[PDB]
Enzyme design. Structure first.
Site, PDB file in Angstrom:
ATOM      1  N   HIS A  53     -13.664 -12.162 -13.548  1.00 60.53           N
ATOM      2  CA  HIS A  53     -13.222 -11.146 -14.491  1.00 60.53           C
ATOM      3  C   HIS A  53     -13.898 -11.273 -15.845  1.00 60.53           C
ATOM      4  O   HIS A  53     -13.907 -10.305 -16.609  1.00 60.53           O
ATOM      5  CB  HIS A  53     -11.709 -11.214 -14.665  1.00 60.53           C
ATOM      6  N   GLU A 108       0.820  -1.205   0.000  1.00 61.16           N
ATOM      7  CA  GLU A 108       0.000   0.000   0.000  1.00 61.16           C
ATOM      8  C   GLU A 108       0.855   1.257   0.000  1.00 61.16           C
ATOM      9  O   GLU A 108       0.553   2.218  -0.718  1.00 61.16           O
ATOM     10  CB  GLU A 108      -0.935  -0.006   1.201  1.00 61.16           C
TER      11      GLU A 108
END
Ligand SMILES: *[C@@H]1O[C@H](CO)[C@@H](O[C@@H]2O[C@H](CO)[C@@H](O)[C@H](O)[C@H]2NC(C)=O)[C@H](O)[C@H]1NC(C)=O
Ligand SMILES: *[C@@H]1O[C@H](CO)[C@@H](O[C@@H]2O[C@H](CO)[C@@H](O)[C@H](O)[C@H]2NC(C)=O)[C@H](O)[C@H]1NC(C)=O
Ligand SMILES: *[C@@H]1O[C@H](CO)[C@@H](O[C@@H]2O[C@H](CO)[C@@H](O)[C@H](O)[C@H]2NC(C)=O)[C@H](O)[C@H]1NC(C)=O
Ligand SMILES: *[C@@H]1O[C@H](CO)[C@@H](O[C@@H]2O[C@H](CO)[C@@H](O)[C@H](O)[C@H]2NC(C)=O)[C@H](O)[C@H]1NC(C)=O
Ligand SMILES: *[C@@H]1O[C@H](CO)[C@@H](O[C@@H]2O[C@H](CO)[C@@H](O)[C@H](O)[C@H]2NC(C)=O)[C@H](O)[C@H]1NC(C)=O
Ligand SMILES: *[C@@H]1O[C@H](CO)[C@@H](O[C@@H]2O[C@H](CO)[C@@H](O)[C@H](O)[C@H]2NC(C)=O)[C@H](O)[C@H]1NC(C)=O
Ligand SMILES: *[C@@H]1O[C@H](CO)[C@@H](O)[C@H](O)[C@H]1NC(C)=O
Lengths: 597, 183
Positions: free
Chosen positions: A487, A357
């Site tokens: 997906h 992150e």
């Protein structure tokens, strides 16, 4: 008095009206994502639709400047990224039908149910209960029932919708001069008008098929090893010269093999490094981890945090009643505001997700000087690679024996080396054939090379040809297996997961070449070496200003993606594997099948 | 000297129409600003910052306004940008002192503060030390607009979106520029 000067005058009234209207939407979305209440949902949807309508009006307004006379390159990039009609070029009824079928596909995927044939009142969804059986069980018949029932009762509902979403998307892409939808998808890797860095959309395919050919001599050996080991957990079900049944792989589809590590660990008498007891028995709180991550990032030469990130970010989980969906993300609300959202605990995996992150945050902080339309990765695959090499480098024994978590000596042997390399290979190089194959199939469907009476046949043929798995029960042309993936149903692109896996490793073998490494590549670190940070920041601060095939040259030295760094990184596991299959048969034949009896 | 009447007004003016307060002939005591606050930015260009008390001239002027964060570096002799070309330009033989400090907790409210404008569309770059209060439609194309918003005819006054949850570089800073040419 020109048709070019009225471009800059217009982009300035848009780069200031959007950077302000986007903040409202982003902040209102954050307010819901960390405090799930009822009024916050509408407070977020209002600003979201406001920003969307504003973007639509600016798009229908910016069609007055013909892109054929603009001479500067940055304004051309902005106008081209703003000009694309996108959807809504169809009629109205067609667009309504497409939106309805997309929502129906997403809903059917999210809330499907499959029960038992001997007790029809106890069925489970996909997420909390099915891919847990498919990940933790060890019985053949149970996995087979799961894998077959998830495709027989939720797959059969997506075919009469996919066979229409294909046509609608084909029309939407042919009404924008693209010749099919696959070209629209590849239109991200397009680069025109640089005189030395050109990249036509048609070449991307070729490039992929010219690099995946260099991986096979390693995937084949990994496959032979995994097979020779699986043939001791379910005997008499795998033949030594056949493929692997597509339900014993580890999850619902076989995307990652990482759930196999408990069956195929080479040396099961050495516990690989896990500093989760040293972190707990030393009173490490949920804030010391981010201090350590920031220290590591400031070591190489990137800036400190913004002092607006420690006050507002939500690092800890709010306990009593603040129920908040926390999937770890890093936000870019704009106007100099960067925040992180993750319900962290004190373990090892979160100690690496913190670095991931913070890598995303450093990237989003570097290029915050460009205009609004150019705040993004060089393409759709740079962001995760930049965010991933940090966590790749922040888990090596040389690092964890200097931060303090590990003992200062911690005698190391080649056995843990092999262990870690294999646990990495079962996730990095185990998902490239599947990704490449699925993308090839979707391209060959959208372009029209596969008539709609030959979908499942060609899909299973390609799975037997490339990935090396075989179906356990014959699948005819009523099912629809590709649509049972996340997906594929929600209309997300997939090629990026095949480019990132390449880019990432290249970056490593570049930066480790600046820090003047000595040993193998997988024992390298870029900490305490300012030249690495400089070489990386030279590319971070570009955004979409320059074509991606240039920002890749500033840090590596080539023009296109390569595959030599990956094999250079996996060389030790390779040399060990090639000496483990003296008796087996590396490769596979496409004739055996679990029902050929 | 009446400095506390310009460093402390309940509100300054926006940049496009700054506030100019001219100082008369009296006694000047700078020892109050010099030890006033953190003073994020304080650069004297002609006069001695360590000997200020030893010189004096005829007239001193105090201009005041409120600008964005990362734009304080444009209030200086010989700069270029959206602020030191269309709103407030300093000459090349400047002699005063530029001072600017943070005011995040006084001029910014949640849900936006749309009362601090700044003009960003002007046909000609501003000559040194001139203000403009025009609000005519800046016409970019070749078609008369007669004074309505639309295409190629934009309105030139645009307002800052000051909010408290900003990063340093967009929080509102207050600037008080002194010019010298009283003792
Ligand atoms: C999370 O959202 C809820 C719902 O809006 C907040 O609860 C109220 O929020 C309003 C808005 O400021 C306050 O005026 C009320 O006093 C709040 N009610 C209660 C019972 O607290 C809640 O405050 C939000 N969470 C936080 C931390 O502010
Ligand atoms: C038009 O292109 C030129 C160069 O092709 C851009 O000029 C750059 O502008 C930035 C910021 O204005 C400067 O930091 C660079 O130094 C300039 N480059 C050179 C070589 O001088 C110009 O910005 C482009 N037009 C717009 C509106 O951005
Ligand atoms: C984007 O869509 C528009 C239609 O919505 C395309 O057609 C032009 O639309 C404008 C606006 O009404 C007309 O004035 C033109 O006569 C239309 N035809 C043209 C410009 O050939 C437009 O071409 C589309 N542009 C792109 C790049 O897809
Ligand atoms: C990065 O460099 C720093 C500074 O040179 C290292 O920190 C010191 O490491 C030595 C090694 O034993 C310790 O004796 C010092 O106490 C450390 N300094 C402090 C303030 O604790 C750091 O170890 C280096 N890290 C890596 C991974 O090489
Ligand atoms: C780990 O390293 C050791 C040496 O440090 C290797 O041991 C040698 O392996 C070869 C293999 O035929 C033998 O001929 C040698 O006699 C071994 N040395 C000793 C002292 O017995 C070992 O093979 C390595 N293992 C792995 C998995 O890399
Ligand atoms: C600017 O105004 C503020 C208040 O409007 C002044 O703050 C006062 O300071 C004195 C001395 O420290 C205190 O006794 C008062 O109680 C303060 N007022 C308030 C409302 O808190 C400040 O002194 C003024 N600045 C100058 C230079 O005169
Ligand atoms: C970063 O922050 C730490 C802690 O305040 C400080 O010691 C260090 O000097 C800072 N470095 C930079 C480059 O801002």
């Amino acid at each position: 008095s020109t048709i070019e000067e009225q471009a800059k005058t217009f982009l300035d009234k848009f780069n200031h009206e959007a950077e302000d209207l986007f903040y409202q939407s982003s902040l209102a979305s954050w307010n819901y994502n960390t405090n799930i209440t009822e009024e916050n949902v509408q407070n977020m949807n209002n600003a979201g639709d406001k920003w969307s309508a504003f973007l639509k009006e600016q798009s229908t307004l910016a069609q007055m400047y013909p892109l054929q006379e603009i001479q500067n390159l940055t304004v051309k990039l902005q106008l081209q990224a703003l000009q694309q009609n996108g959807s809504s070029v169809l009629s109205e009824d067609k667009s309504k039908r497409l939106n309805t079928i997309l929502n129906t596909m997403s809903t059917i995927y999210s809330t499907g149910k499959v029960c038992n044939p001997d007790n029809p009142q106890e069925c489970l969804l996909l997420e909390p209960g099915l891919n847990e059986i498919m990940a933790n069980s060890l019985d053949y018949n149970e996995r087979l029932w799961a894998w077959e029932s998830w495709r027989s009762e939720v797959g059969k509902q997506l075919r009469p919708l996919y066979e229409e979403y294909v046509v609608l998307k084909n029309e939407m892409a042919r009404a924008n001069h693209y010749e099919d939808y696959g070209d629209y998808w590849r239109g991200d890797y397009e680069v025109n008008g640089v005189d030395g860095y050109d990249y036509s959309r048609g070449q991307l395919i070729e490039d992929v098929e010219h690099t995946f050919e260099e991986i096979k001599p390693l995937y084949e050996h990994l496959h032979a090893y995994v097979r020779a080991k699986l043939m001791n957990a379910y005997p008499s079900y795998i033949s030594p010269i056949g493929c692997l049944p597509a339900h014993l792989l580890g999850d619902m589809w076989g995307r990652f093999w990482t759930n196999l590590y408990s069956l195929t660990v080479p040396f099961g008498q050495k516990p690989n490094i896990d500093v989760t007891d040293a972190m707990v028995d030393q009173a490490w709180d949920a804030q010391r981890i981010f201090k350590e991550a920031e220290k590591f990032f400031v070591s190489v030469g990137l800036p400190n945090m913004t002092q607006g990130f420690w006050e507002n970010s939500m690092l800890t989980d709010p306990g009593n009643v603040q129920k908040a969906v926390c999937h770890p993300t890093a936000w870019d609300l704009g106007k100099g505001d960067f925040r992180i959202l993750m319900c962290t605990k004190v373990t090892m995996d979160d100690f690496l997700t913190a670095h991931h992150e913070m890598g995303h945050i450093q990237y989003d902080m570097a290029y915050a000087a460009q205009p609004f339309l150019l705040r993004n990765g060089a393409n759709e695959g740079f962001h995760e690679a930049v965010g991933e090499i940090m966590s790749l480098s922040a888990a090596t024994p040389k690092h964890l024996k200097s931060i303090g978590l590990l003992s200062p000596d911690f005698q190391e042997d080649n056995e843990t080396e092999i262990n870690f390399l294999l646990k990495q290979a079962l996730t990095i190089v185990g998902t490239l054939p599947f990704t490449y194959m699925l993308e090839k199939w979707r391209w060959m469907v959208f372009k029209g090379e596969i008539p709609k009476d030959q979908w499942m046949k060609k899909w299973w043929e390609m799975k037997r040809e490339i990935v090396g798995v075989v179906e356990p029960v014959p699948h005819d042309e009523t099912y629809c297996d590709p649509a049972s993936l996340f997906h594929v149903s929600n209309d997300y692109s997939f090629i990026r997961y095949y480019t990132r896996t390449l880019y990432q490793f290249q970056f490593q073998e570049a930066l480790c070449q600046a820090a003047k490494h000595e040993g193998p590549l997988h024992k390298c670190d870029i900490s305490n070496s300012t030249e690495a940070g400089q070489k990386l920041f030279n590319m971070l601060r570009l955004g979409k200003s320059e074509p991606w095939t240039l920002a890749l040259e500033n840090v590596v030295g080539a023009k296109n993606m390569n595959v030599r760094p990956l094999l250079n990184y996996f060389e030790p596991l390779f040399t060990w594997l090639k000496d483990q299959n003296k008796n087996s048969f590396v490769g596979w034949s496409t004739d055996w099948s679990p029902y050929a009896d | 000297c009446p400095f506390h009447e310009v460093f402390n007004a309940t509100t300054f003016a926006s940049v496009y129409a700054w506030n100019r307060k001219r100082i008369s002939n009296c006694v000047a005591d700078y020892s109050v600003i010099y030890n006033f606050a953190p003073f994020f930015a304080f650069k004297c260009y002609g006069v001695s910052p360590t000997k200020l008390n030893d010189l004096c001239f005829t007239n001193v002027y105090a201009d005041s306004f409120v600008i964005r964060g990362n734009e304080v570096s444009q209030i200086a002799p010989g700069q270029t940008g959206n602020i030191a070309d269309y709103n407030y330009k300093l000459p090349d033989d400047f002699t005063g002192c530029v001072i600017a400090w943070n005011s995040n907790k006084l001029d910014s409210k949640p849900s936006g503060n749309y009362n601090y404008l700044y003009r960003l569309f002007r046909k000609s770059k501003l000559k040194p030390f001139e203000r403009d209060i025009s609000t005519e439609i800046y016409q970019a194309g070749n078609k008369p607009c007669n004074g309505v918003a639309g295409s190629n005819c934009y309105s030139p006054l645009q307002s800052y979106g000051f909010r408290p949850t900003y990063g340093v570089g967009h929080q509102p800073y207050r600037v008080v520029v002194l010019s010298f040419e009283v003792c």
